[PDB]
Amino acid sequence: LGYTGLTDEQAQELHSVYMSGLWLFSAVAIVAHLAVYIWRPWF
Amino acid sequence: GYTGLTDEQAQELHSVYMSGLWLFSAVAIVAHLAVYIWRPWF
Amino acid sequence: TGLTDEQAQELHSVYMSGLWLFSAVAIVAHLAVYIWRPWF
Amino acid sequence: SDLGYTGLTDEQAQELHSVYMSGLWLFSAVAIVAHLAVYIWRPWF
Amino acid sequence: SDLGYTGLTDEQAQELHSVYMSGLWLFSAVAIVAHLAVYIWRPWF
Amino acid sequence: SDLGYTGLTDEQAQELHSVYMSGLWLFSAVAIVAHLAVYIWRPWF
Amino acid sequence: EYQNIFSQVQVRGPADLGMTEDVNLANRSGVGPFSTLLGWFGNAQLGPIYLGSLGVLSLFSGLMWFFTIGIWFWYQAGWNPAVFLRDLFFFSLEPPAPEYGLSFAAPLKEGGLWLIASFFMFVAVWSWWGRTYLRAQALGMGKHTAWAFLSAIWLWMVLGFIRPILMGSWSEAVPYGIFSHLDWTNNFSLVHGNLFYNPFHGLSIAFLYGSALLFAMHGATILAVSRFGGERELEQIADRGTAAERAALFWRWTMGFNATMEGIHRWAIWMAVLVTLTGGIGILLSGTVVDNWYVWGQNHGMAPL
Amino acid sequence: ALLSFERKYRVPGGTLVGGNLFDFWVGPFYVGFFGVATFFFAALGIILIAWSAVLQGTWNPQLISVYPPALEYGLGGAPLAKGGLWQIITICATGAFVSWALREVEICRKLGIGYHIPFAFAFAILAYLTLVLFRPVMMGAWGYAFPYGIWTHLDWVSNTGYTYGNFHYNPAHMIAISFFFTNALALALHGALVLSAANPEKGKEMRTPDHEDTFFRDLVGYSIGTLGIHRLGLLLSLSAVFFSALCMIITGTIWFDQWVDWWQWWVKLPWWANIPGGING
Amino acid sequence: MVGVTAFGNFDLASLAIYSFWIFLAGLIYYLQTENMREGYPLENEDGTPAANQGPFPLPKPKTFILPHGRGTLTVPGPESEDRPIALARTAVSEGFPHAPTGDPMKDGVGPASWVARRDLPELDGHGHNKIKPMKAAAGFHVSAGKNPIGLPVRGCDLEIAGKVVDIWVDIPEQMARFLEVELKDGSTRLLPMQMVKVQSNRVHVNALSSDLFAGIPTIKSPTEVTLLEEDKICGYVAGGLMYAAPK
Amino acid sequence: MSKFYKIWMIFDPRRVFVAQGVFLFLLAVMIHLILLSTPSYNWLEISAAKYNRV
Amino acid sequence: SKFYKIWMIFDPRRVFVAQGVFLFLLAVMIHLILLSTPSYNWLEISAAKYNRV
Amino acid sequence: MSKFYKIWMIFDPRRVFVAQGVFLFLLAVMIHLILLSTPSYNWLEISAAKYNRV
Amino acid sequence: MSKFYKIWMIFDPRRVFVAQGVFLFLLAVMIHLILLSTPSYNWLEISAAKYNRV
Amino acid sequence: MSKFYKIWMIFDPRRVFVAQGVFLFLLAVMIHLILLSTPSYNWLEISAAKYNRV
Ligand SMILES: COC(C)(C)C(=O)C/C=C(/C)CC/C=C(\C)CC/C=C(\C)CCCC/C(C)=C/CC[C@@H](C)CC/C=C(/C)CCC=C(C)C
Ligand SMILES: [Fe+2]
């Protein structure tokens, strides 16, 4: 467990931030794909 | 052991990794099912 | 390598368990393919 | 009267050789079964 | 007597040579059987 | 003196030469048998 | 007449085992015997071989690429060694026919085995990357070992996987011959008119020459200071001795502009990577961009019109 | 001008003509007796290439061209509208490269290092001397030389190369081409280790000479050391120009055929040349 | 872009070249710059910072962290020489060589210079001297080489100067570096293997004469050669190449 | 199969994870490209031809 | 029989890493050999059976 | 096995096992490839010929 | 014949065995390949003739 | 001829033996290959015509 020296609290906070960013980006991607599919579906 | 991990540490790490593997595999199963329904390859 | 008889015993048991699992999956797969389309 | 590069004992070499021969006999038996199966299925002579 | 370069004894060389000759005779016997089988199956003379 | 660079003795060289000549005679005998067999089977003269 | 070629006095002994900071000694064991001829030419230590995970990874995929192409070649040879010996370096492993083109439905004879064989050499070259890379990481070196190596792979990749996909055909990759590759390189120029007016090739033409031409002098500068302590180069940046001091000014006096020990080795890899980096984009343009260099060079007044 | 440590390295002696003559330094560069000769010829040699343009009338930057005489004229009267310009511009550059190389030895002697750099360059020039007064003359006239026009960029392959077919099948050329790769593949590692030890992982120490061997030994399994490469780099690079220029000579009056057909000489071998099967037989 | 230029002739094709024109020149500026780490800023004969420095400036001085626990070197810091440059400027006027005032070989000018190194007889990364005497070389021995013991040492001027006793061998390179030639005077002189050319049976010194054998610089430690002498010996030894150009 | 943690007693997790990441990514790329290669299975081609959108 | 003994003489780590590389390469080779043949190129027969091409 | 067992004394077992494994796998692969190259023993083809798989 | 056994007193066994193994395998391979080229002795072709598999 | 034993006093037996073995084998392969190449004494070739195995 000595590869970076981060704490459980530090890793918790960092992971929460990263997941928030991931969810934001994924939401934008979902909106984009929905818009394209409505405009022109690829199935 | 190359690495000095404990039994408890390895237990926790393996549990986490297996959880991730099961999640990813579940997504893969859903995807394959969707494709096969849409267009089977058999 | 300096492993003990007990250590080698445990490691070999684990490895054989894994081998049997993998081989079982392979057997199932081959059976499925052969039923679907035999190659003999 | 070991006489190796290797320092193994007579007992160690005995055990290792027994193990290796067991493995060889197992593998050879599988090979014999396979060749018999192929020859029955389609002989090459 | 010996020359003295690998350092093997007369007894050690005796045993090693006996083992090697046994192996050679075994292998040669198998080869003889194989050649006989092929010649019976299809002679090359 | 014994002019030895290799340092072998007269007895050592005697034994080694006897062994080598025995091997040479064995090999040559086999060769003679082989040539005789071929010549009988198909002479090249 | 002693132009610094041969060691005159030969001294030999126990090889250094090796020095470890962060090296996994589990993968490193054993030492090797000593080479005869190079002891006149120079050093003789052949080993040790780091049986590394990537090295093992490269060990098989290279070997399978090494061996498997042999067997399909024998299928050409008719199982006759004297036939195989004669038309050695005449056997050539073809890619799939252009009807398949991009499509990976090739038969084994008709280039199917190329994609089979080529996938394994695809594994080996990339896997050797880290074997260089990771070992530096253990000893804490620069990663230039990696970045000069990727220079080749970027152009090595475009020959097979990048340039052919942009059109959409596997024929436009290189058949695996000893002579079919060489006929292919000439064939490439003929396909797109002449390869003459292809710029990034013509740029690459300069820099392969820059490799050996410059380094003949660079070594000679070191060869000049084997009397002046050239073989202790590592601290000759740190402790600038007469090795660094004298010759460099000769490069001031001949060329006007001079350099030092540390920056002189920048030119080595940095010029060298121009050998491979330039071609990778350069070979692209013939297929997907400029189908005939003979007319394209006419645009910018380097062609006769 | 002078570096922070140069000054003492300039001693007015050893010069090839006479020890103490014309050995002043013009700022960073040095101009001397042999210092004139390359400056003498290169200064005009460029400018008559400018006069090459006017004979055509073109001034488009690359479209300026210098045209060698064909086989016919040789050592005779030739219109400068065709020749006696490429023939004279031969005089300038050819003198220059000899002038510059033999210039170098004086400052080499001054700083007391080997003649290898003049030796290396003088041998590098020997590739060029192969191209004019050697390859043309060995047949008999400079017609068999490529034009000294910039826009040609050595585009004489039209009749040059394919008279020999696939020309990378000159045996020496097959050897010659491979050499620059051997240099360029090895070149990285010396450009690596001394620079990768000079630059370690940002945050790691500079390396020691004991570190130097271990990296290369565990990788491919053999270290000759630093000097082996510098010698090989000189062994390689001069061989590459040596095996390239030599085969240039044996294109003329030695090989008048197609380079592929020579490899058939192995396929010509009476023992197993004519066994049916495979690709030939 | 299927044969489709943006307009006329300018497309992605020329874009790569136009990229390559700018891309190259930036590196060449960087390549010129990173070679500028010794002897800058430029000086003149007098010692003033020169009028011309050039468009390419000094790159940032990065002090290297050093191994062995010896200390640190800051390169490029202020460049120092700290060595005998007692000389005579031939001309106050700009652009003239510098005549040797007294004995140049003590000072070291032209081919005779010798640089101020570290004063440490260099140990290896393992903590032992890189150059080790044969007698103190534990384990290694003369294996298959022409042991110079038995070869009369000959100078350029064709006088027998000495005879070899030991070789101070390079342990890392496992190739010989220095040659013990103790002279008839009494001092034990080392000559680098690289400098002189030995054939099958003699030891010839083609750069300097047997008179300069008498002044070959002495070593303070009969067991370890110091760095400063290394050049100072060779600077002494290699300098006479031109002073003894006659003879 | 609970006993499988001994491999983590054997293998440093970081390198296994990075090898796995490269492995999975390259495999997904290869499968996707083999798919898209086939005219039969090419979702872009299928959509283009079905919806008459050539 | 009893094959525990190999481990105490022969290294584990190398065994597992080499075996992993071996199995992946082997599986890829066999799969590609299948895919190259017209029969057992299951994509093509899938197309032909559902007659979509 | 009366006297064969001394062989492991003169040969280091680790290396002989490595070499044997490499040799065995190479041999099996080579023989299988040779077998396939023969049109009579292309076990893929026999399946194709029997069941009339085009 | 009786006293050959000093050859091991002359030679190191292990190198002799390495050479013998390489020699024997390479020899067997080349003999087999020549037989296999030999139309009279390509058992794989001979298997085809007697059984009317083409 | 009687004091040929001094030959081994002059030369090391091991090197001579290596040379003899290598030379003997290279030689034997040479002659066999030449016979196999010549059509009269390619002993394989005759066997076909005598038995009419084609
Ligand atoms: C003793 O007997 C044996 C058999 C062991 C031998 O010794 C035989 C040994 C041999 C070496 C056999 C002879 C075969 C060689 C000579 C091969 C020579 C190969 C070349 C000359 C070509 C090398 C590379 C050429 C190029 C340009 C390759 C393209 C670069 C890569 C990017 C190619 C990658 C291609 C693809 C398709 C990757 C994707 C994989 C798909 C399946 C997705
Ligand atoms: Fe340097």
Numbering used by the authors:
A (entry chain X): 7 to 49
B (entry chain Z): 8 to 49
C (entry chain 2): 10 to 49
D (entry chain 3), E (entry chain 5), F (entry chain t): 5 to 49
G (entry chain M): 2 to 306
H (entry chain L): 1 to 281
I (entry chain H): 1 to 247
J (entry chain Y), L (entry chain C), M (entry chain 6), N (entry chain 4): 1 to 54
Show the paper's wording:
The reaction center (RC) and light-harvesting complex 1 (LH1) form a RC–LH1 core supercomplex that is vital for the primary reactions of photosynthesis in purple phototrophic bacteria. The RC–LH1 supercomplex comprises an RC surrounded by the LH1 ring that is made of multiple αβ-heterodimers. LH1 collects photons directly from sunlight or from the peripheral antenna, light-harvesting complex 2 (LH2), and transfers excitation energy to the RC. In contrast, some Rhodobacter species, such as Rba. sphaeroides, possess dimeric RC–LH1 core structures, representing the largest photosynthetic complex in anoxygenic phototrophs.
